Amino acid sequence: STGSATTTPIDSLDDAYITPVQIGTPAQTLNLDFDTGSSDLWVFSSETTASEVDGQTIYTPSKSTTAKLLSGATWSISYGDGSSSSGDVYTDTVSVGGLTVTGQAVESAKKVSSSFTEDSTIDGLLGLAFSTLNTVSPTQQKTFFDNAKASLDSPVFTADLGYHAPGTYNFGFIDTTAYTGSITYTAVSTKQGFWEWTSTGYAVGSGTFKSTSIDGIADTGTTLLYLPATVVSAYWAQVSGAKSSSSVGGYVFPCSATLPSFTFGVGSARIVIPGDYIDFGPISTGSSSCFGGIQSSAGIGINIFGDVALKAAFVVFNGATTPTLGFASK
Ligand SMILES: CC(C)CN(C[C@@H](O)[C@H](Cc1ccccc1)NC(=O)O[C@H]1CO[C@H]2OCC[C@H]21)S(=O)(=O)c1ccc(N)cc1
Ligand code: NA
Numbered sequence: 001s002t003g004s005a006t007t008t009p010i011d012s013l014d015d016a017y018i019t020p021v022q023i024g025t026p027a028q029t030l031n032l033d034f035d036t037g038s039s040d041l042w043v044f045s046s047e048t049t050a051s052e053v054d055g056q057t058i059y060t061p062s063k064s065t066t067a068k069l070l071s072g073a074t075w076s077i078s079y080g081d082g083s084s085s086s087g088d089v090y091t092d093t094v095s096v097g098g099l100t101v102t103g104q105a106v107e108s109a110k111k112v113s114s115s116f117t118e119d120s121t122i123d124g125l126l127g128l129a130f131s132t133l134n135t136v137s138p139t140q141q142k143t144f145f146d147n148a149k150a151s152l153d154s155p156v157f158t159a160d161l162g163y164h165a166p167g168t169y170n171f172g173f174i175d176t177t178a179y180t181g182s183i184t185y186t187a188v189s190t191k192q193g194f195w196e197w198t199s200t201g202y203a204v205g206s207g208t209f210k211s212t213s214i215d216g217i218a219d220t221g222t223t224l225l226y227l228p229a230t231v232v233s234a235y236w237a238q239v240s241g242a243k244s245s246s247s248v249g250g251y252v253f254p255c256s257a258t259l260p261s262f263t264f265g266v267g268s269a270r271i272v273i274p275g276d277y278i279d280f281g282p283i284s285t286g287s288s289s290c291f292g293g294i295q296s297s298a299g300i301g302i303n304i305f306g307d308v309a310l311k312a313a314f315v316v317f318n319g320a321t322t323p324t325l326g327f328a329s330k
Helices: 114-118 144-151 229-236
Strands: 003-009 017-023 028-035 041-043 068-078 084-096 099-112 124-127 156-160 167-171 184-187 196-204 210-218 225-227 243-245 250-254 262-266 269-273 279-282 289-292 294-296 303-305 314-318 324-328
Touching (some): 003 084, 028 041, 041 084, 184 196, 229 294, 250 294
Antiparallel strands (some): 041 124, 184 324, 196 262, 262 269, 279 289
16 A cells, blocks of 8 residues: 655744645544654544633544443653643554544643643644554554554655655655655664664765764654754854854844855765855844754754755665665655
C-alpha cells in the first residue's frame, strides 16, 4: 500500500505545516502537525477542557463506531517549546492520504497548554519519530508509521515541504519526479528516539565549505534551523545589521536585508537553503526588525534540522531494519 497527502503552511511565514487526517467511522477530519521529532498522535477532543478549546476541530470518540477506549491507558507529553498536553487513549481507524491503519492509538486530550489553545489552526500532532518515545502508560503505543510499515510497498515515508507553499508527505514510495540529482543516504542513530544523523559541514553564501561533524535531528515539527553558536554566529556575521537580541530571544536583522544562502553537507552531497527561507518576518507587528530562521541550539541540548533546512530538500525517512535518512536537492 501507499499514501500521499498534501501538507499546507498554517500562515504566510511557514510557522508550521498541517496535514488532513481522517479519524474514526464515519471519518472525522482533523488537521494535524506531522512531527518527526515526537512519537504521540494526539488530538483536541470532546474531552478537552472547554476553556482550552478555541477554534480547533475536535475528535469525538463517542461518535466513531470503531473507537475503543484503551483500558487504563493515559498519556502526558511535554515539548521543547514548553507546551504540553495529556489525556486518555482510544484505538481507532486512522487514514492519511488514502493509507489506512486500523487500531491506531489516538491520544485524546483532556488538557492542553496555552500555546495549543491559542493556535486555532493545529488540531493535534501526528508523531513520526521512533515509537520508543511514545508516552502512553502503562503500555507504550506505536506510531502511525510503525503500524503501517509492514503493509507499505517500501518501509519509508518522505517529506517534501514547500517554501511559502504546500508540499507533500508520501508513505510507502519515493516519487522520483519530486527531486533533482540523486538521493544521498546517511546513517541514523535511534539511541535518543529521533531521526538523528551527522551533517558533514556547512557553507555561508558563496563561501567555502567547512568540513565539521554536526550531529542533529531531522525534525518536521520544528520550524527553524538550530545549530551550534559558532556556526550561527558565522552565518549572521554575513548579514549587515544583524544582531543577537537577548530580549527577542535570538538573531534579528533589518527586514529589507539581503540574506545569504546556507549550505549543509549530507555525506559528499550539499543541500543549499536559499536566503529567503531564513526570513521569519517582523519581530512584532510593524517593526523594521525581522526574526532569523537560523538560531543557536545552545540550551536545547541538541541541534535541530527543522523546516528551514528540510524544506530545501526532498527527505526520505527510511524505516528499514537499520533506519537511514536520504536527502536530495529539488
Ligand atoms: C511541534 C511541537 C508540538 C513540538 N516541537 C518539535 C518537536 O519535534 C520536539 C523537538 C525537540 C526535541 C528535543 C529537544 C527539544 C525539541 N520534540 C519534543 O519536544 O519531543 C518531546 C517528546 O517527549 C520528550 O522526549 C523527547 C523530547 C520530548 S517543539 O520542540 O515544541 C518546537 C517547535 C518549533 C520550534 N521552532 C522549536 C521547537
Ligand atoms: Na518539486
